[PDB]
């Protein structure tokens, strides 16, 4: 907030000092147009080591930190004790008048001292809190000089003409902190802080700030009127063009934004908002008592009221919809019970000294912390028993932890705060150094040493913004801003640049991509996103009700998705309709529980239902019928036994949480093993199976043995952390030549020959999507192919194969393919055209929410495809031939059942295929069909590289491409593998990569159509990854 709309008072507060120790010793300024107050920073500006207090006759005025006046009734003999205001409860006074007073903060229960000084005023002169842990306050001459740590440190304010000049950091080192300078009448013209920010600003003659700027592009002008009231702001850039109307009689001021709003505040004796009107029209009121605000409705009626105790803190919370939360506290303020809806009671214990030393979650379980005599931190008992133990430097920063496990990282931090150095379990060592920039532009450079030789150097600009990134290969990331730290630019290290635009309001409306073309947002009166306009030309529109929820999503083809939420704030309703016809094409409905928690979602295909125990843990998950059970640890949450169809898993887990062992359907178990970093280093089955895996010091998994049963791996990177060299015992060695952007353009995979046996390389264009792929087989030339984009999706594309003879080549193979999207930016037809021979044309069929609904191949197969109202897809059919289906089932986000269906359309759940991950992960853990079980070997992204028999036979070897083409041959009797990347499954009548949400093509490296949740996953829309071997996306984002 720039304006004070209760007064008209032009509003500043800047961060100056913050100083580390078992009490922070804080320091902000604060700037108020009319004030009459003055602190160390010279007149209108208040801090917190200037308050103060003064006798006022029978009364007490407290000045805070903000030029407020607390008013207190001194007694007859003279001796406050825990004397309180009411309009700011938790400020608490106590002391002989003739010795001297204190404050208490009730909030954060540290006191301030006030000594005697002249004329019955008494100044701040230390402020400590229940530990002992004391900040003495030295003045001479009047002037705050110094200031006494007990850490250890002491502060130096230097003082010229009874102005603060300096805020030195004096022993045990001697640092500046604070530089000052003033203009003629003495106020405060320049203020350069060593972690926050150097500003300057202009006055009148009667102090009212008529502008402030920082070191580069911020600068903003203010003008009064005669009474000193903010009429105007304006940015030289352009932003906040904004204007202040006034109304004493009415209450009222109007607030005119630079975008054609008009805001209209009504306000009370207090200067309160008692009402409210956006300019949207939308109405918000709020009742006050005395400073304390009792009741607050919103513009759908929703009313949220607060109750208070007799020693004015907040006690009982109403909320929309009938839940209500309790507060209690003990005698000090200290937040002792909270009972929240449900029966969920937290509770709070604390010591003589405010430590809370046992902490008692709804569930009756108890966390146990020991504290130091000097309040720190020293011990955690979980309630499994594992213990957290810290230890703390001279400044009371934590030094070292000692984590359940035994393992202790060692760290280091300077007097400002800034790590220095980490020392991991294992004795590895990253080191970060600082150095300030003393010629020229201001700024300041942070170099990284990491324990692998790898170096990285981060630089900040003049307003301690990041100017650019070094990796440890030498490229450069840079960035550029403009006023108001708005990020304008970004600079890959190839020299192309991203740009951004924001209207008047700093709201982004503008993204333009290196290729050039723009991405545009559109706002409403109120700030919200009423339309965008992709790269494409596709523009969608959006509608919000009064709560400001969005109830339509119009899209270009003229279907409208609508939306009813609950007054929680839950989605209980989408439909869709289709242009000027109401008529509702489908439905959707989401019930919940009184707990306002899913228990019911359906659409026309799916009924998934969700069961809950006391601690709102999901222990039934079903979906169509098909049925999932889960039982967890008592003590960690984490599931220990999940069921679905008769067949039971069960979990065991360490102090930690890590996995320890895993068995399923009375089969040999599975044991882990972990080291003191929390990596997995083996994992063996008395059957035989065993996984041996190492990292590299910065964590990278480098190393993989395994035990036609032995299998050697070795990953090795580049000082860019990009994956450069595989070694694979079964398939041979891999080199990958990566570009500026961290992109692979060369990948060859040589066997036992020195001529590689095959070669993949690559081109990219600026929005880096592929472009060009050749192939070579034993060094001459295989195929090669150009693909060409069209606002970044894939558009046409042409190919070549080669033959070799004799040495000379002759093609075999001469085919464009072209792609056909329609104006919702989803792929429709994908056509590829041979020399001569016959068009082969794919069709694709969508629904409203952009699902893949139908595909129709080029011999005329029809696939239908139905998805639950998660987007989950639960059914493949085939609707025109004698061609078995499939049924998915699902746990969460992981696909963990593949059912087969007959021709005759009856599961064959006995046939069915599980998939086991640990719950939450995307990384399969083992696969059991017909009794027949089988563990997985995956590699650095979690993709299925082996599957292997209980006994450690490979019966299943993976060989993809760059890119995820699987074609690795294997036996007819090997089990089948359709699992790719994490997240994705191959349907094999399309070769497409199934994703949760869209559908990807592993030959152009893109989705068939734009990506769901907008800028909100990138800049590409049509884009899976810049490198596949480096990103992940298990969802289709």
Excluded at 159 to 182: E, F, G, K, N
Excluded at 387 to 402: E, F, I, K, P
Aim: charged share 25%; net charge negative; proline share 4%.
């Amino acid at each position: 907030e720039p304006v004070d709309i209760g007064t008209g008072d032009f509003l500043q507060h800047f961060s100056v000092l913050s100083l580390p120790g078992s009490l922070p010793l804080t320091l902000s300024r604060f700037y108020r147009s009319q004030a009459k107050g003055t602190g160390i920073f010279g007149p209108k500006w208040t801090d917190e080591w200037s308050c103060m207090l003064t006798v006022h006759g029978n009364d007490m005025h407290f000045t805070n930190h903000e030029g407020v006046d607390l008013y207190y009734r001194i007694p007859q003999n003279g001796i406050f004790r825990d004397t309180a205001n009411s309009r700011q409860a938790y400020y608490r006074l106590s002391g002989d008048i003739r010795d001297e007073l204190t404050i208490f903060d009730r909030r954060s229960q540290h006191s301030q001292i006030f000594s005697l000084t002249d004329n019955g005023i008494y100044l701040l002169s230390a402020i400590h809190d229940r530990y002992g842990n004391r900040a003495d306050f030295i003045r001479t001459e009047g002037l705050l000089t110094g200031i006494h740590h007990s850490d250890g440190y002491t502060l130096a304010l230097g003082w010229q003409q009874r102005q603060l000049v300096s805020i030195d950091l004096a022993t045990p080192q001697r640092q500046r902190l604070v530089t000052c300078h003033y203009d003629k009448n003495g106020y405060l013209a320049e203020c350069d802080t060593i972690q926050f920010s150097h500003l300057w600003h202009e006055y009148t003659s009667e102090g009212w700030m008529t502008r402030w700027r920082d070191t580069d592009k911020t600068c903003v002008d203010i003008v009064y009127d005669t009474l000193g009231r903010t009429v105007s702001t304006l940015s030289t850039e352009g932003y906040f063009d904004d204007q202040f109307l006034y109304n004493d009689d009415e209450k009222c001021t109007t607030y005119l934004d630079a975008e054609g709003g008009e805001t209209r505040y009504w306000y009370n004796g207090d200067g309160l908002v008692t009402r409210s009107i956006d300019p949207l029209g939308r109405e918000e009121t709020s009742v006050w008592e005395n400073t304390r605000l009792r009741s607050r409705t919103d513009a759908l009626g929703r009313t949220t009221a607060y109750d208070y105790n007799n020693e004015g803190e907040i006690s009982r919370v109403s909320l929309p919809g009938g839940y209500s939360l309790y507060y209690d506290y003990n005698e000090h303020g200290q937040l002792t019970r909270l009972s929240a809806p449900g029966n969920q009671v937290w509770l709070w214990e604390y010591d003589g000294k405010g430590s809370m030393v046992c902490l008692t979650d709804p569930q009756g379980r108890q966390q146990q912390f020991s504290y130091s005599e000097h309040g720190d931190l020293l011990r955690q008992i979980m309630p499994n028993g594992a213990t957290w133990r810290w230890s703390h430097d001279a400044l009371h920063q934590v030094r070292a932890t000692t984590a359940p496990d035994g393992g202790v990282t060692q760290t280091e931090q300077d007097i400002l705060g800034r790590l220095l150095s980490v020392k991991d379990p294992l004795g590895y060592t990253t080191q970060f150094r600082y150095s300030k920039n003393h010629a020229g532009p201001q700024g300041s450079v942070e170099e990284i040493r990491r324990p692998d030789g790898v170096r990285e150097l981060m630089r900040q600009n003049s307003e301690k913004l990041p100017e650019s990134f070094t990796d440890g290969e030498g490229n450069t990331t840079r960035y550029e801003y403009g006023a108001f730290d708005l990020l304008t630019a970004v600079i890959r290290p190839d020299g192309e640049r991203l740009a951004c635009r924001y209207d008047k309001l700093t709201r982004l409306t503008e993204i333009t991509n290196a290729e050039g073309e723009h991405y545009r947002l559109r706002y409403d009166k109120a700030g919200q996103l009423v339309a965008e306009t992709d790269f494409t030309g596709r523009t969608l529109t959006y509608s919000y009700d009064a709560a400001g929820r969005c109830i339509r999503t119009t899209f270009p083809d003229g279907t409208h998705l609508n939306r009813q939420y609950s007054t929680t704030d839950q989605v209980t309703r989408e439909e869709v309709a289709q242009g000027d016809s109401d008529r509702v094409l489908s439905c959707t409905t989401f019930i919940y529980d009184a707990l306002s928690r899913l228990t019911e979602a359906r659409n026309n295909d799916a009924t998934v239902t969700y069961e809950y125990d006391d601690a709102s843990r999901v222990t039934a998950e079903t979906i169509n019928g098909r049925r999932t059970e889960y039982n967890y640890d008592p003590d960690q949450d984490t599931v220990s036994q999940r069921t679905t169809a008769g067949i039971t898993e069960c979990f065991t887990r360490g102090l930690t949480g890590e996995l320890t062992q895993w068995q399923i359907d009375g089969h040999t178990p599975l044991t882990l093993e972990h080291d003191l970093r929390g990596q997995e280093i083996s994992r063996q089955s008395e059957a035989g199976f065993s996984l041996r895996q190492n990292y590299t010091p910065t964590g990278m998994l480098t190393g993989q043995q395994a035990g036609n049963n032995t299998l050697q791996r070795q990953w090795l990177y580049d000082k860019a952390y990009n994956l450069t060299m595989i070694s694979d015992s079964l398939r041979g060695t891999m080199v990958n030549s990566v570009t500026a952007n961290d992109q692979i353009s060369h990948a060859t995979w040589t066997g036992s020959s020195d001529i590689p046996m095959r070669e993949e390389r690559f081109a990219y264009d600026r929005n880096l999507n592929i472009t060009r792929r050749q192939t070579q087989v034993n060094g001459v030339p295989d195929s090669e192919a150009y693909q060409h984009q069209q606002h970044g999706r894939v558009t046409s594309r042409e190919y070549k194969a080669w033959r070799h003879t004799t040495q000379f080549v002759r093609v075999i193979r001469d085919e464009q393919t072209t792609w056909k999207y329609d104006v919702n930016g989803r792929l429709v037809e994908k056509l590829i055209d041979k020399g001569g021979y016959r068009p082969l044309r794919w069709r694709y069929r969508w629904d409203a929410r952009s699902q893949l609904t139908g595909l129709e191949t080029p011999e005329g197969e029809r696939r239908e495809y139905k998805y639950d109202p998660f987007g989950r897809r639960i059914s493949k059919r085939c609707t025109n031939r004698d061609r078995p289906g499939t049924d998915f089932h699902w746990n969460g986000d992981q696909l963990t059942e593949e059912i087969p269906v007959g021709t005759d359309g009856t599961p064959e759940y006995e046939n069915a295929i599980r998939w086991i991950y640990e719950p939450g992960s995307f990384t399969p853990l083992a696969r059991y069909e017909k009794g027949q079980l089988h563990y997985t070997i995956t590699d650095t992204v979690g993709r299925i590289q082996e599957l292997l028999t209980e006994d450690g036979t490979i019966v299943w070897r993976g060989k993809q491409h760059l890119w995820g083409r699987e074609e690795g041959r294997n036996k007819d009797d090997a089990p089948s593998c359709r699992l790719r990347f994490p997240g994705q499954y191959e349907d094999e009548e399309s070769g497409l990569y199934y994703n949760r949400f869209r559908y990807y093509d592993c030959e152009a490296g893109q989705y068939l159509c734009a990506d769901p949740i907008g800028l909100r996953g990138g800049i590409n829309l049509y884009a899976y990854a810049p490198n596949p071997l480096s990103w992940i996306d298990p969802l289709g984002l």
